[PDB]
Amino acid sequence: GAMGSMERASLIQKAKLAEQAERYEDMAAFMKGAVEKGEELSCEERNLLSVAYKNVVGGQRAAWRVLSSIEQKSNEEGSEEKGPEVREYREKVETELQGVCDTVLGLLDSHLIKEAGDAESRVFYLKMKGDYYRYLAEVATGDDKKRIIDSARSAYQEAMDISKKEMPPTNPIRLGLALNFSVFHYEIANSPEEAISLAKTTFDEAMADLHTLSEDSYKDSTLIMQLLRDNLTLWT
């Protein structure tokens, strides 16, 4: 790996600089290098890893959606034939996106998840696994689509089980996991009722636990609770 010669601490330092400079591809490459040093990641480091790849794949997903929409319009009745270029370019972006997802899933499998024993780390990584399989599912149209969806589901479900046993209902990781699994249900699994039920139960159980929190923890939890509410408002 190109980062093999750089110190772990230097990779972390540079990931933080890259974030400040909004250089998310660089940030992701630095954090991949840091993971490949083989040591576990701290909370802060896990969040650097997630921010980097979320931004990279987020941009790819947005581009894929633009191109997919153009492609769909090209296959409507009355649309003039423009050749293979729209499909080709959508495929190019799609392949790049799948590559990033495979990279992230590879880091999780080699060997972040297996060494993650604390609830905070294990849930975080399993949520990531669900998320990146979800992104693969968004673009999947073939024989493996069902298996990709089931891989996302399975990762989210393991994360949910741990989070419910080991974390308070206001824990931001738990809340964010539930938010994203709810979106999985709505957008991927064709299960809007499950999505709504999960978002509502999560919100209500968090509300009941806010009284236990400091001012700063309250701020963190209520921010994510508002995202749950926003989705519920969109869906009802």
Binding site: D131, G176, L179, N180, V183, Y186, E187, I224, L227, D230, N231, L234, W235
Partner: peptide, 5 residues
């Protein structure tokens, strides 16, 4: 699109 984190 719905919110995710």
């Amino acid at each position: 699109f719905p919110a995710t984190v």
